[PDB]
Subunit: 237 residues, 4 copies
């Protein structure tokens, strides 16, 4: 079916589905129940930034979130990754809301991936960055409450005119253009993703979170992937 | 209809359609009849390389072809470009054959474009390079005699098993993913394309040429765009 | 002697030395008396951004300054450049003050240059960006009132503790590491520079300006290059 | 004193100094006696390519050598690195010869490093690539038998006019410009180095090897760092 491997920004502790006691960031492998996690003191009204890294060589999944003047969080997961995801995949981001609400916003999106080896010493690459999210991307793959064109930012969840974010939405955005993290002569595969985030929230118990993931090409939003589930996980934790 | 603006590598002088007396390189604007040209001493059996540049600021279309130890060619055309092509376009390459034959091969494909201004000081980009053209690109947009998977190269024209290139083909390859050379807060737009080429040819009168171009999204191959026409120009010079 | 070719941000009209009637930006070739200019409505207290571009091919010197929501300025000068500057040069920035005062500040510094051709299809490059200007760069070449380590910015002119900029200073900062814009097999040379600027100023007649330039390696500050002169021009307009 | 941390290409098994029974690649930390190693089947007369990677986050030292059609080698060492090397360092390459001889040649040199975090979301970078090693680099830091200007390559060891490599030499080349792998707001530091190599050798027992390393700024060649030692290790294994 539809598979995914992503890094989640869980501001809402959902201990039910083995979700911890506090808002955190975790690496989900085909599962919402992160394989690893790290306490994450969210910052209401502040601009954040998250970074991911992984080597075909080292075979490790690391990510780090942060805000200025503030101390950061670190978490890593050891994963070959070649047996999980396909040679050819797609990249995107998302976040859901259901019982409560919250803004789920990214002002910037930078993406680069490289493939090497082939001792041919050529290398094959794709990189790219955003910041002014106009209306009608075209190279953008928006699905759900996802919207574009408000203030040159990309807002994934439902928010009202004044600024009355809704809680029943789920936003998913993926690049129209695929990626390649394989290659026969593949003896080195690298990719780095780093996007900005502005997470407000009236309620003192913000929800439900934000992430980043890869997935099929014919990938579609989960049906009841609202709130925790994350809008990437098909239901069954 | 279908529009295009490209840089042509015409190894075959077709003076009929105002084509010069010798194999050359020219900039075609909605027309095969280059606006500018420059004598180009082709090199049979040798690896070449072509480069293009253009600034939203300077508003000039420059390209330069070359081989090692050998002297290069230069040609430029002054063109705003914002009134010709759409905000959103697609990028590709191609070449045709009809009366005669020839290989029309590129071993490498590098592409970068940047958009700036918005005094926001963010910038929005996309870059990427190829060299090992596997079978079933996916991020590749092949149309016609275009093929992939022979020796980690991209061969656009029809060539037989042994190596008996055909003469009735036309190969066009474009990136699956669109590009953006607009932007409201657009006060600077840049893009650089550079790919490799291996042009053999038994006959002492090789044909018919190779190029590079942008075009619509629903762009389709010309019908009788074989040989000179170039497989980008819809017939009517 | 000491030569320079730079792009000046003249907020102070000094018509005496053929300086126009209003604060502007101009391209100085061995001379302060810009070869070209363009009205420039400075923005007190606002963050700016300036961009430069030039091709060995097109052989044109273009730059563009701007702030958000605000309209930009454009100016270009046609200059081969290979007869002016040396194969090997150095890059930097500066600004002076003498009769009046003003802050002359850059928060960010991005720099890339490429050399191509050699039909070898290799290319030789150097790029780099700054934003958090710590104390004791080392890769930084500071001379004069130039300082580093205040708020992760690079302030070139003299400013007091509270924030009482002085008017008798001149700040020049250049990369410790040289550059190369030559090459025998040189048939294409490219470089792009873009840095941020925060220009305050109590007085309603700010001074004296900011720029960007290349120069010798044994380059040294002008003696009376205070104010207009610019701290790059050796005196004699 | 003079410290170094590098990746060695040991084609000569020197079991005496705990050097294995076969030509290999190993990571030397202040010591020649690699912390890790991996059998490496060298290819006489063939073009090679080596790659290194390390994250401030993952804190792992990985490198991979290879030639076309041929199977590669992998080796990694877990090393924070912040307690070993200084905030500010220099980058280079080298190789020695003493009892026997061999060419120790690199045709290409690509280098990029990034510093992030500061939740400021700016990042500070430096990248660059070579391939045509002209005479008198200037941005190059050559020491010893190191030479430049033969065929647009960088040859570090002594070789005669015809092509009669010597065996008593040692070549070290480092970038004139320093690097920065620190930063207070440092919560992510990345760098990737990849250069080409052509290792000939008449004798069926080539020697002595090639590497890559960082070190002090006032770094100087070892005195008896000929052969194994490597010309980076000060003698005392
Ligand atoms: Ca949760
Ligand atoms: Ca023709
Ligand atoms: Ca003035
Ligand atoms: Ca040894
Ligand atoms: Mn969770
Ligand atoms: Mn023509
Ligand atoms: Mn002026
Ligand atoms: Mn060893």
């Amino acid at each position: 079916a539809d598979t995914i491997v992503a890094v989640e920004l869980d501001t809402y502790p959902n201990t039910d589905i083995g979700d911890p006691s506090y808002p955190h960031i975790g690496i989900d492998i085909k599962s919402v129940r992160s394989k690893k996690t790290a306490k994450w003191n969210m910052q209401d009204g502040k601009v954040g930034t998250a970074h991911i890294i992984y080597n075909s060589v080292d075979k490790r999944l690391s990510a780090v979130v942060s805000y200025p003047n503030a101390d950061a969080t670190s978490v890593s997961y050891d994963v070959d990754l070649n047996d999980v995801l396909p040679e050819w995949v797609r990249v995107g981001l998302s976040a859901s809301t259901g019982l409560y609400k919250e803004t789920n916003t990214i002002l910037s999106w930078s993406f680069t991936s490289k493939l090497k080896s082939n001792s041919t010493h050529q290398t094959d690459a794709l990189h790219f960055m955003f910041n002014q999210f106009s209306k009608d991307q075209k190279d953008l793959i928006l699905q759900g409450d996802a919207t574009t064109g408000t203030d040159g930012n990309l807002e994934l969840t439902r928010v009202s005119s004044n600024g009355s974010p809704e809680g029943s939405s789920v936003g998913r955005a993926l690049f129209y253009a695929p990626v390649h993290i394989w290659e026969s002569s593949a003896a080195t595969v690298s990719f780095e993703a780093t996007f900005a985030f502005l997470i407000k929230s009236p309620d003192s118990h913000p929800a439900d979170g934000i992430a980043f993931f890869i997935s099929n090409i014919d990938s579609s939003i989960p049906s009841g992937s609202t709130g925790r589930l994350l809008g990437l996980f098909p239901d069954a934790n």
